[PDB]
Paper text:
Streptococcus pneumoniae scavenges essential zinc ions from the host during colonization and infection. This is achieved by the ATP-binding cassette transporter, AdcCB, and two solute-binding proteins (SBPs), AdcA and AdcAII. AdcAII belongs to the cluster A-I subgroup of SBPs, consisting of a conserved structural fold of two (β/α)4 domains connected by a rigid α-helix, with the metal-binding site located at the interface between the N- and C-terminal lobes (Loisel et al., 2008; Yukl, 2017).
In this study, we investigated the Zn(II)-binding mechanism of AdcAII by mutating each of the four Zn(II)-coordinating residues in the SBP. Structural analyses of Zn(II)-bound AdcAII variants revealed that specific regions within the protein underwent conformational changes via direct coupling to each of the metal-binding residues. The binding site mutations impacted protein conformation and interaction with Zn(II) to differing extents. Quantitative in vitro metal-binding assays combined with affinity determination and phenotypic growth assays revealed that each of the four Zn(II)-coordinating residues contributes to metal binding by AdcAII. Intriguingly, the phenotypic growth impact of the mutant adcAII alleles was, in general, independent of affinity, suggesting that the Zn(II)-bound conformation of the SBP is crucial for efficacious metal uptake. Taken together, these data demonstrate the importance of SBP-metal complex conformation for bacterial Zn(II) uptake.
Numbering used by the authors: 28 to 59, 65 to 128, 133 to 255, 259 to 305
Write the structure that this text describes.
């Protein structure tokens, strides 16, 4: 190993949490909603030492990887293995295609983000046991700063008179459950899931019922159709599914969106 292990990550939260757990160690990079990585990414995955993805409920293509058939030494790691996933909003009481029932957007909960960084540190310690104390020490520093981020915004959401907000797609369910908030997504779990006409009417009644004055968009066009039907304002709220391309850490990018949400709910 020149720079250490060659680690490849699925998307931005996994790339950020692996990079901060590894720290100075290894060579961490990220492959280039729709998902389906290119032909070169899968080739780069089989040429790497470690590949880390979030969950089978998100990167469904990760389950088709067969390192034994391709004669590859890549060790695929599911960063959220063992974490308890909540039901998809609107499907809580469904008894059971089944992958559509569980919500994967846990990285937006500061507590569950630290839980995923610990699993990454544990799984990296099972592959690279010599540096196990560096992975755990970097993870505990990430968990500590995440738990302090939760303690900081917990009183900020308790005093909020408005605890209901609407976002571009159903991605902030874990964040709302962390601070006792209520949320509704225009689109479903995936941004491609366009609302049906009957569902759009429910979003209209939902905004009117709980006096929602703001729809949080992403940096879609169905959201621009309801700004006339509801008269709400538009503010940005990044679910951190794409790289913000800045010089902030993951928890700093997460805190920024939390501060945008907390100032609006007051
Ligand atoms: Cl329920
Ligand atoms: Cl998604
Ligand atoms: Na509900
Ligand atoms: Zn799994
Ligand atoms: Zn539960
Ligand atoms: Zn229920
Ligand atoms: Zn039954
Ligand atoms: Zn090492
Ligand atoms: Zn070393
Ligand atoms: Zn601190
Ligand atoms: Zn999403
Ligand atoms: Zn900084
Ligand atoms: Zn801070
Ligand atoms: Zn401010």
């Amino acid at each position: 190993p020149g720079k250490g292990m060659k680690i490849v990550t699925s998307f931005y939260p996994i790339y950020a949490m692996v990079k901060e757990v590894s720290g100075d160690l290894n060579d961490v990079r990220m492959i280039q909603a729709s998902f389906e990585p290119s032909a070169n990414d899968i080739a780069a995955i089989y040429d790497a030492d470690v590949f880390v993805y979030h969950s089978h409920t998100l990167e469904s293509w990760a389950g088709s990887l067969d390192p034994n058939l391709k004669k590859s030494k890549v060790k695929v790691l599911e960063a959220s293995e063992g974490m308890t996933l909540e039901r998809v909003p609107g499907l809580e009481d469904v008894e059971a295609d089944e992958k559509t029932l569980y919500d994967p957007h846990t990285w937006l909960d500061p507590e569950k983000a630290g839980e995923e960084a610990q699993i990454i540190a544990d799984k990296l310690s099972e592959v690279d046991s010599e540096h196990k104390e560096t992975y755990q020490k970097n993870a505990q520093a990430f968990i500590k700063k995440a738990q302090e981020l939760t303690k900081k915004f917990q009183p900020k959401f308790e005093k909020a008179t408005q605890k209901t907000f609407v976002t571009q797609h159903t991605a902030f369910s874990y964040l709302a459950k962390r601070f006792g908030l209520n949320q509704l997504g225009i689109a479903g779990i995936s941004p491609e899931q366009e609302p049906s006409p009957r569902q759009l009417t429910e979003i209209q009644e939902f905004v009117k019922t709980y006096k929602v004055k703001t729809i949080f968009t992403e940096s879609s066009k169905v959201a621009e159709t309801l700004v006339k039907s509801t008269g709400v304002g538009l503010k940005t709220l990044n679910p951190l599914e794409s790289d913000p391309q800045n010089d902030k850490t993951y928890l700093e990018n997460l805190e920024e969106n939390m501060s945008i949400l907390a100032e609006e709910l007051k």
